[PDB]
């Protein structure tokens, strides 16, 4: 269905083997499914076509809102409140975006697990690795900020992380 992008939500070909009856006994499954189509799937499709043509009679559009990039907290003065406000709003929007990214990865992982069945432990290694990477990135970015999270606290956390990394690298090089 064109309602969603296929690349964002990748799916396997899932080829299905053709029926190969071995005995002469007619399986009731096929009779039940045929009567199911005849009694359910036809009126439903008819009503959907009617509704779709009614919608086609009156078409109107809605658009995705675009946001312009604004200077962030690292290029903000100490007590300048306006640019601080803009940086805080931009940081919050970015935060929501990363939360939705993690949501997409988690949905991918769950779908892989259910689809591959009892071979999931070997057939979903790639999704598990992607989820591990995204989870590590998100935990590094936004964990332990607190209930009153803000851009300055995230910046301070990132700065102390760079301090730790720089000290460790200097010590290893000078070891």
């Amino acid at each position: 269905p064109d309602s969603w992008d296929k690349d964002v939500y990748p799916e396997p070909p899932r080829r299905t083997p053709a029926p190969a009856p071995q005995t002469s006994l007619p399986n009731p499954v096929t009779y039940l499914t045929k009567i199911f189509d005849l009694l359910v799937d036809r009126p439903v499709t008819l009503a959907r076509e009617f509704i779709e043509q009614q919608h086609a009679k009156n078409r109107y559009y809605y658009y995705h809102r675009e946001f312009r990039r604004v200077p962030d907290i690292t290029e903000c003065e100490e007590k300048d409140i306006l640019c601080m406000f803009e940086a805080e709003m931009q940081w919050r929007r970015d935060y929501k975006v990363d939360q939705e990214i993690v949501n997409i990865i988690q949905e991918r992982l769950k779908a892989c697990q259910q689809r591959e069945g009892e071979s999931y432990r070997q057939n979903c290694a790639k999704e598990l690795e992607q989820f591990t990477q995204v989870s590590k990135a998100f935990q590094d970015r936004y964990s332990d900020l607190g209930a009153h999270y803000s851009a300055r606290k995230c910046l301070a956390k990132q700065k102390q992380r760079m301090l730790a990394e720089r000290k460790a690298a200097k010590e290893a090089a000078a070891a």
Binding site: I73, E75, Q160
Partner: protein, 121 residues
Amino acid sequence: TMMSGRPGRVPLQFLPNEARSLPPPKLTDPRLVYMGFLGYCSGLIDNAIRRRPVVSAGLHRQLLYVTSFVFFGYYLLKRQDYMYALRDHDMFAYVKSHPEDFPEKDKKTYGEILEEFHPVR
């Protein structure tokens, strides 16, 4: 602050002439309407005390209370605004005449300011 000893102050002036250079308060000022409401409440209490119909005992007396409260409130607002203008004028004059006590702080960016981070756990 103690602006009692401010030089060039007339001993008993409610409003000096230099107070006429400021924008007068509007008649629809919320403070004036509040003063009128206080006058109306005073009239209602007066009617209640004398054991009279509270809402409609004397319309003339309630009108007099409202008008007197509005008059005095307008004058009080003028005086208060003038006093605050004087305070700000003295503030700015002093900071202008004493640059050594109010140095310009070097504007520093957050990207070069190290703030300690306390994790919440």
